[PDB]
Amino acid sequence: PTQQTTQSAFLATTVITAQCHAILNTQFTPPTVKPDWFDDLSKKLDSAKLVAKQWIDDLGPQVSASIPSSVINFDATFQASIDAIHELYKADPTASGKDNTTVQQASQIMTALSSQVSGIEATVKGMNKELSDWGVKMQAAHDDLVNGATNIQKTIIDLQTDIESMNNAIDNNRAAIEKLNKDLVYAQVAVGVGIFMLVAGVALTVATAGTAAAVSGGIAAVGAASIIAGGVTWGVLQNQIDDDYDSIAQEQKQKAEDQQQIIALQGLSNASSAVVSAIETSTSVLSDFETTWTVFGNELDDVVTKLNNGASMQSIIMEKVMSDAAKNEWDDAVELAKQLA
Amino acid sequence: FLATTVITAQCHAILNTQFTPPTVKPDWFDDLSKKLDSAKLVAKQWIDDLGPQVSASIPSSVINFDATFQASIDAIHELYKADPTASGKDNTTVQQASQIMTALSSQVSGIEATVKGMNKELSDWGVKMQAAHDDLVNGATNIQKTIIDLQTDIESMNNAIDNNRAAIEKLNKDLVYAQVAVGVGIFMLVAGVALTVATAGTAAAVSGGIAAVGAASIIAGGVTWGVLQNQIDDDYDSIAQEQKQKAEDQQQIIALQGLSNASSAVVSAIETSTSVLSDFETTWTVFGNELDDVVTKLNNGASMQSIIMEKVMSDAAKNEWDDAVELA
Amino acid sequence: FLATTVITAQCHAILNTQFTPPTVKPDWFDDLSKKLDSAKLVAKQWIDDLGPQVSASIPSSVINFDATFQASIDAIHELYKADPTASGKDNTTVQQASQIMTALSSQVSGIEATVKGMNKELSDWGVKMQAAHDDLVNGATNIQKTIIDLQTDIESMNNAIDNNRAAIEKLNKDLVYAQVAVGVGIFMLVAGVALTVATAGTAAAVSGGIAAVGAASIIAGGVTWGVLQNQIDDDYDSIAQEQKQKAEDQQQIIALQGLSNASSAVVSAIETSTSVLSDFETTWTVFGNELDDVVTKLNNGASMQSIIMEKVMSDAAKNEWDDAVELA
Amino acid sequence: PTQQTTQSAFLATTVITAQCHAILNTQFTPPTVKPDWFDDLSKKLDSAKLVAKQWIDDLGPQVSASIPSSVINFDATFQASIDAIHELYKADPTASGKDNTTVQQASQIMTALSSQVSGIEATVKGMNKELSDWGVKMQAAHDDLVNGATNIQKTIIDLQTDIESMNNAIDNNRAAIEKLNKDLVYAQVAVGVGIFMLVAGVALTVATAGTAAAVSGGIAAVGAASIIAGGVTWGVLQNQIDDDYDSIAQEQKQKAEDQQQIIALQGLSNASSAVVSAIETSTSVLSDFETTWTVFGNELDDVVTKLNNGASMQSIIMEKVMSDAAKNEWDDAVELAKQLA
């Protein structure tokens, strides 16, 4: 029927009303350290945001004035034309050739019906034009993401090699912390034998009254040197372990920020590409929906002119249009349009 | 599938939750509260201003279409039935129908204006909800920053506890050497004294040297025993303190994971609220153009304007009727 | 050899292989889990949506050609068997033929548009399949990365075990020297102290040097006996620790070989799926062009369109009658 | 015959789509250090994916619109319109000179078959034109890979010499670790002798106290020197062996990465050369398939102008164009083109 181009023209526009929100909700965080690409990819988001602004409060609501509202507006008069002709059937169902006044009255009322459906297709024309030039603005705010300062071709590869760089740094710092543990055990052994050799040296110096003070002073001096070496090595290695874990924290939150950036950029790119790919089908099927009502207006024009020429009132029942067999289909079409709202 | 109850449920969830701090509150937390309560400004400004307006715009369009519109259609219907052969705009009866037609199409213009103003009243509230979503999801990255920072802190405390346990093992194995030092020192001290007494002091230098390394070994092993035992107590206290810090910051991880789950739930709620506002604006501009239709039903013809406009009036009234009672 | 059964079997093979982490859970196994669950999302998006799409496109092409096409061919076969001579555009019989043919060739338009849109609905899925393939391979090279790393870890622990065994043999040789140092030392100590007590009345420090070198020999031999014995026990504990590391690394390498075989089976299934996908697009373009043939059939003549177009519709529809029962 | 060239041109293009899938399978992994040839042969891969991606989405399936669907659309009429003239033979089986409307209609049905066959070979021209531009773009992507910074003539050779470098460095490092094992044995006997003569020298110094104390302090001094020298030699050699096995890890991972890159570049070269050595046969035999329908177009059009001007109705059966054994071959053609599906 004609209902399945109405539902298809409404569905491909509700897809855009949904996915403009997917573009507009995409808003990534300012990082700790700000990269090079961050500013000149932000404005190309805002241009891709503001035109989606023109789909959330201006054109998104207005595309519902086109597809359900013009069909129910046409059927509001198409529920009135049939009874107005069916009442005048009882007066003169034989009057032909533009003779009786009521036949010419019904003729100019169906001419007003043709002007009403011409206004229907004019409303759909205005809505399709306001869809199309916004589509040029949204596509112009889209294709800059794929031509210059691209999110995919440059920054996805850049943030992937940045995530790999931070993973490499994390691996190097963890192997470094392993080696510093293996050196810290040596520092503790050195300060232990330093304690022992220092007290043994000064004890052999005192306990022999300095008769062997050369070798005992040597033992005490190597003990004090081992104390100092183990102590400052322990302090230095613990400072390097703490600074290595601070570096692990820094590049770990850097890798987290880069993952949060790539998911937002992939969402923005996929939403904008699907918005363009569905705006194409939306404009095409709205063009078919506009020409459907335009050729139906021309068909009603041909019926009006052939009714002005010579057509009998029973020849209108010989026609398909003003009977019950088409208004019964379009009652289901407006029931579908009430399902679509 | 009623898209007003969906926004009712989402704003109920947004007005519902109020997230609690962790044990130590960071620098952004109250600011995250300052990115929540502004949303707690709008979700009541929906349900105490625009929630009342969506429950007060429909009794203006069901009651004034129950009494005024039905009789005002019946009047022009009976004016059709009184003379179905009339013509002309300067007719008496066509004038009597045209005054009521222009009056009804002029008094639906005010309710048209308030419905078209309701579009603007929902528009700015929708963009404000979008902005309050984007500021809250802007603040909700510091939670992941502090979570991954405290995860690094947990890894650092695990490394330090492993280091201190290896130090406990090595200091036990060296404390054995300090005890062996005082043992062999006490033995060779009494060996030097007994060898000096037994040889009547003739083995003076040898047993004096044995006793000298004996005393040096007992006081050196004693000081090394005291220092290594004190160090073992110190890094047992360090193991206890770093295990306590690991449990405490792990508790902070669960607290901030609950906070991040709450903030993710609230921003997903506004994420769905934007699509449900899109569908409600779809239905609302359908109703606004339905009343635009009733205003463009001011069109008056020349001959018998009654059946050419008033059945369209009643049919658009019925299309408003079924949808507004679905919104009731 | 049925191409759709091949791809549904391969997608269910992607669904039933999840892979297990090794003992030390690395820093990339969460990323490999992300690559697998994205490939699972692609395989389940094909199984849950495009799967029933292929199985629901065919009864829509059978049922509409069961009765709706056959009533059309029966009607415009009656119009040719009863009146094969009528011509001219305003003729009533060719008007009936053009009415039922602009009914059929424009009621097939939605079904043709669906079957034509499924070409792009397959193409974006093939793009997502080759997308989920390559990041999975870039994650699965890290398998043999750590496999090579644990292989040289095995080599390092084997070299260190051989080093500790050579050190154990040399220390078990040097213990004999420390023990003969204690023996010769206690012999020279008792000889030197006997030599000093036998020379008490005069002086003999020549006798007092033998006992000094004997006492230093027992002290030095005892200290290195203790140190070399504790180093032997330390080297046995090091052989035990390195053999434990070698056993656990050999245990981890076969888990990594299993994970490598899992990622290899998944990428092999994706490759045969992406080839049989092109073999399915091979016939999907055939059915797309076959429903484009009805667009070629919509061009109607003026003079007895039955003998011009209707058996063409019957022959192409019978080719679709072959194909749609070949797809089930 | 008239079907086996269609099957041969289809066997020519399934080879193209299979080796194009072999091109799309080729994606080599990023190494730890990205060499000189990478950053170009990334995009010289990647662009040689994108034009190859044109075969994957549409154009490969669109050359599968040329052969196996046009035979169906051709015997939509050729299995049809032979039996239309068989009922026209019932009225006038010999009437010539354009006297009847039946002969004038059997003429225009053959002109309709002429326009249908011309539309078939025009669809074949469109699909072979798309194959022509895809084939020259595939040659355009093959040229810069196989000539400018050649993957096989340069980087296969440079990677083989890099593998030889890593092999010689691995054997060098394992010889160094064997030498370091022997030097470790010497350092262990150094510290083992040094502890003995240290404590022997200190016990001799504390016992003797003469010039024997001077030579005993010498013994203890060379003992402490041997302890410190053997100890730092032991520690330095364990440090060197651990760093050297980390070097063995680095070189073995580099050798495995290089073997993976060589296998990927061998697969790329085999796939792209098998594409380019078959795409010219694909265009040549699809041009053969187009000129087969062009020969069929003139071989129908001469029958058409003879049937218009001076043919009988038995003479249509007499010619082999409208014959039935050849039409049995042209039902075998449809069964073959459906077997190719």
Short mmCIF file of N, CA, C and O in Angstrom, two decimals, chain C residues 59-114:
data_model
loop_
_atom_site.label_atom_id
_atom_site.label_comp_id
_atom_site.label_asym_id
_atom_site.label_seq_id
_atom_site.Cartn_x
_atom_site.Cartn_y
_atom_site.Cartn_z
N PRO C 59 10.82 -17.22 2.93
CA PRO C 59 9.37 -17.46 2.82
C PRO C 59 8.63 -16.24 2.30
O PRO C 59 7.51 -16.37 1.79
N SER C 60 9.24 -15.07 2.41
CA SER C 60 8.67 -13.87 1.81
C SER C 60 8.79 -13.91 0.29
O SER C 60 8.00 -13.27 -0.41
N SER C 61 9.76 -14.65 -0.24
CA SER C 61 9.88 -14.81 -1.68
C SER C 61 9.12 -16.04 -2.16
O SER C 61 8.84 -16.18 -3.36
N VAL C 62 8.78 -16.95 -1.25
CA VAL C 62 7.99 -18.12 -1.64
C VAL C 62 6.50 -17.80 -1.60
O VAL C 62 5.77 -18.06 -2.58
N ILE C 63 6.02 -17.23 -0.49
CA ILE C 63 4.58 -17.02 -0.29
C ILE C 63 4.01 -16.00 -1.27
O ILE C 63 2.91 -16.19 -1.81
N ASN C 64 4.77 -14.93 -1.56
CA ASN C 64 4.32 -13.95 -2.54
C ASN C 64 4.35 -14.52 -3.96
O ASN C 64 3.61 -14.05 -4.83
N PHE C 65 5.19 -15.52 -4.22
CA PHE C 65 5.19 -16.20 -5.50
C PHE C 65 4.36 -17.48 -5.47
O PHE C 65 4.23 -18.15 -6.49
N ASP C 66 3.80 -17.82 -4.31
CA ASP C 66 2.91 -18.97 -4.21
C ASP C 66 1.56 -18.68 -4.85
O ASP C 66 1.08 -19.43 -5.70
N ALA C 67 0.94 -17.57 -4.45
CA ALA C 67 -0.43 -17.29 -4.85
C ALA C 67 -0.57 -15.95 -5.56
O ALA C 67 -1.34 -15.84 -6.51
N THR C 68 0.16 -14.93 -5.09
CA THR C 68 0.00 -13.59 -5.64
C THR C 68 0.58 -13.49 -7.05
O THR C 68 -0.05 -12.88 -7.93
N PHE C 69 1.73 -14.10 -7.30
CA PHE C 69 2.25 -14.14 -8.67
C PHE C 69 1.44 -15.10 -9.53
O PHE C 69 1.26 -14.86 -10.73
N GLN C 70 0.97 -16.20 -8.95
CA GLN C 70 0.30 -17.22 -9.76
C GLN C 70 -1.12 -16.80 -10.13
O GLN C 70 -1.60 -17.14 -11.22
N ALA C 71 -1.79 -16.02 -9.27
CA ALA C 71 -3.07 -15.44 -9.65
C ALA C 71 -2.89 -14.40 -10.76
O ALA C 71 -3.74 -14.30 -11.65
N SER C 72 -1.77 -13.67 -10.74
CA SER C 72 -1.47 -12.73 -11.81
C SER C 72 -1.20 -13.44 -13.13
O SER C 72 -1.71 -13.01 -14.17
N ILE C 73 -0.41 -14.52 -13.11
CA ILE C 73 -0.11 -15.22 -14.35
C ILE C 73 -1.35 -15.95 -14.86
O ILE C 73 -1.56 -16.06 -16.07
N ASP C 74 -2.25 -16.36 -13.96
CA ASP C 74 -3.49 -16.99 -14.40
C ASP C 74 -4.44 -15.97 -15.02
O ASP C 74 -5.08 -16.25 -16.03
N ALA C 75 -4.51 -14.76 -14.44
CA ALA C 75 -5.36 -13.72 -14.99
C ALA C 75 -4.88 -13.23 -16.35
O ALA C 75 -5.67 -13.15 -17.30
N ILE C 76 -3.58 -12.94 -16.49
CA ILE C 76 -3.12 -12.44 -17.78
C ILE C 76 -2.81 -13.61 -18.73
O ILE C 76 -2.47 -13.40 -19.90
N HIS C 77 -2.95 -14.85 -18.27
CA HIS C 77 -3.03 -15.98 -19.18
C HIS C 77 -4.44 -16.18 -19.71
O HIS C 77 -4.60 -16.55 -20.88
N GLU C 78 -5.45 -15.94 -18.88
CA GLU C 78 -6.84 -15.92 -19.34
C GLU C 78 -7.06 -14.80 -20.34
O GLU C 78 -7.76 -15.00 -21.35
N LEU C 79 -6.47 -13.63 -20.10
CA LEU C 79 -6.64 -12.51 -21.02
C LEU C 79 -5.93 -12.73 -22.36
O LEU C 79 -6.28 -12.05 -23.33
N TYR C 80 -4.98 -13.65 -22.44
CA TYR C 80 -4.37 -13.96 -23.73
C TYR C 80 -5.03 -15.15 -24.41
O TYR C 80 -5.17 -15.17 -25.63
N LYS C 81 -5.43 -16.16 -23.64
CA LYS C 81 -6.11 -17.30 -24.23
C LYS C 81 -7.54 -16.98 -24.65
O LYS C 81 -8.09 -17.68 -25.50
N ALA C 82 -8.13 -15.92 -24.09
CA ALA C 82 -9.48 -15.53 -24.48
C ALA C 82 -9.48 -14.40 -25.50
O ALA C 82 -10.36 -14.35 -26.37
N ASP C 83 -8.50 -13.51 -25.42
CA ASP C 83 -8.45 -12.38 -26.35
C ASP C 83 -7.01 -12.09 -26.75
O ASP C 83 -6.37 -11.21 -26.17
N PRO C 84 -6.47 -12.81 -27.74
CA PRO C 84 -5.08 -12.58 -28.16
C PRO C 84 -4.89 -11.54 -29.25
O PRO C 84 -3.79 -11.48 -29.82
N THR C 85 -5.89 -10.72 -29.57
CA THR C 85 -5.84 -9.87 -30.74
C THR C 85 -5.90 -8.38 -30.42
O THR C 85 -5.63 -7.55 -31.30
N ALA C 86 -6.26 -8.01 -29.19
CA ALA C 86 -6.48 -6.62 -28.85
C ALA C 86 -5.17 -5.84 -28.78
O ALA C 86 -4.12 -6.37 -28.38
N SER C 87 -5.24 -4.57 -29.17
CA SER C 87 -4.08 -3.69 -29.24
C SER C 87 -4.54 -2.27 -28.95
O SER C 87 -5.72 -2.03 -28.67
N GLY C 88 -3.60 -1.34 -29.00
CA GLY C 88 -3.91 0.05 -28.72
C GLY C 88 -3.97 0.35 -27.23
O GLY C 88 -4.43 -0.49 -26.45
N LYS C 89 -3.52 1.54 -26.83
CA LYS C 89 -3.33 1.83 -25.41
C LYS C 89 -4.65 1.99 -24.65
O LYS C 89 -4.71 1.63 -23.47
N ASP C 90 -5.69 2.49 -25.30
CA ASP C 90 -6.97 2.73 -24.64
C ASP C 90 -7.87 1.50 -24.61
O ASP C 90 -9.02 1.60 -24.16
N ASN C 91 -7.39 0.35 -25.08
CA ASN C 91 -8.17 -0.88 -25.05
C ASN C 91 -8.38 -1.34 -23.62
O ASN C 91 -7.49 -1.19 -22.77
N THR C 92 -9.57 -1.88 -23.33
CA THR C 92 -9.92 -2.23 -21.96
C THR C 92 -9.17 -3.47 -21.48
O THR C 92 -8.82 -3.56 -20.29
N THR C 93 -8.89 -4.42 -22.37
CA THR C 93 -8.20 -5.65 -21.96
C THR C 93 -6.74 -5.38 -21.63
O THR C 93 -6.23 -5.89 -20.62
N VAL C 94 -6.05 -4.56 -22.43
CA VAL C 94 -4.68 -4.21 -22.12
C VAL C 94 -4.65 -3.23 -20.94
O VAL C 94 -3.65 -3.13 -20.22
N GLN C 95 -5.77 -2.53 -20.70
CA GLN C 95 -5.89 -1.73 -19.49
C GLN C 95 -5.94 -2.62 -18.25
O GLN C 95 -5.28 -2.31 -17.26
N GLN C 96 -6.68 -3.73 -18.31
CA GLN C 96 -6.69 -4.69 -17.22
C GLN C 96 -5.32 -5.33 -17.02
O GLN C 96 -4.89 -5.52 -15.87
N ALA C 97 -4.63 -5.65 -18.12
CA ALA C 97 -3.29 -6.23 -18.04
C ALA C 97 -2.30 -5.26 -17.39
O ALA C 97 -1.54 -5.66 -16.50
N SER C 98 -2.32 -3.99 -17.80
CA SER C 98 -1.47 -2.98 -17.18
C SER C 98 -1.87 -2.67 -15.74
O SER C 98 -0.99 -2.35 -14.94
N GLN C 99 -3.15 -2.78 -15.38
CA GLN C 99 -3.57 -2.60 -13.99
C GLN C 99 -3.02 -3.70 -13.09
O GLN C 99 -2.41 -3.41 -12.05
N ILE C 100 -3.21 -4.96 -13.47
CA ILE C 100 -2.70 -6.05 -12.64
C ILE C 100 -1.17 -6.11 -12.68
O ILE C 100 -0.53 -6.50 -11.69
N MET C 101 -0.54 -5.63 -13.75
CA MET C 101 0.92 -5.63 -13.77
C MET C 101 1.53 -4.45 -13.02
O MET C 101 2.60 -4.62 -12.43
N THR C 102 0.87 -3.29 -12.99
CA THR C 102 1.34 -2.24 -12.09
C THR C 102 0.92 -2.49 -10.65
O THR C 102 1.42 -1.81 -9.75
N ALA C 103 0.02 -3.44 -10.42
CA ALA C 103 -0.19 -3.97 -9.08
C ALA C 103 0.98 -4.87 -8.67
O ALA C 103 1.57 -4.66 -7.61
N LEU C 104 1.33 -5.85 -9.51
CA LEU C 104 2.35 -6.83 -9.14
C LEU C 104 3.75 -6.23 -9.12
O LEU C 104 4.49 -6.38 -8.13
N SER C 105 4.15 -5.53 -10.19
CA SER C 105 5.49 -4.99 -10.30
C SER C 105 5.74 -3.78 -9.40
O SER C 105 6.87 -3.28 -9.37
N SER C 106 4.73 -3.31 -8.67
CA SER C 106 4.93 -2.29 -7.65
C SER C 106 4.58 -2.79 -6.25
O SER C 106 4.87 -2.11 -5.27
N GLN C 107 3.95 -3.96 -6.13
CA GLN C 107 3.84 -4.59 -4.82
C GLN C 107 5.09 -5.39 -4.49
O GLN C 107 5.36 -5.63 -3.30
N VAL C 108 5.85 -5.81 -5.50
CA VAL C 108 7.14 -6.45 -5.24
C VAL C 108 8.24 -5.48 -4.87
O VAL C 108 9.37 -5.92 -4.61
N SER C 109 7.95 -4.17 -4.85
CA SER C 109 9.00 -3.17 -4.69
C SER C 109 9.58 -3.16 -3.28
O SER C 109 10.80 -3.01 -3.12
N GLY C 110 8.75 -3.35 -2.25
CA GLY C 110 9.26 -3.40 -0.89
C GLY C 110 10.09 -4.64 -0.62
O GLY C 110 11.12 -4.58 0.06
N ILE C 111 9.67 -5.78 -1.18
CA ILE C 111 10.43 -7.02 -1.03
C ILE C 111 11.75 -6.94 -1.77
O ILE C 111 12.80 -7.36 -1.26
N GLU C 112 11.73 -6.36 -2.98
CA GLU C 112 12.97 -6.14 -3.73
C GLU C 112 13.90 -5.17 -3.02
O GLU C 112 15.11 -5.41 -2.96
N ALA C 113 13.35 -4.10 -2.43
CA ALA C 113 14.16 -3.14 -1.70
C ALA C 113 14.77 -3.76 -0.45
O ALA C 113 15.92 -3.44 -0.11
N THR C 114 14.05 -4.67 0.21
CA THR C 114 14.62 -5.37 1.35
C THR C 114 15.76 -6.29 0.93
O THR C 114 16.84 -6.25 1.53
#
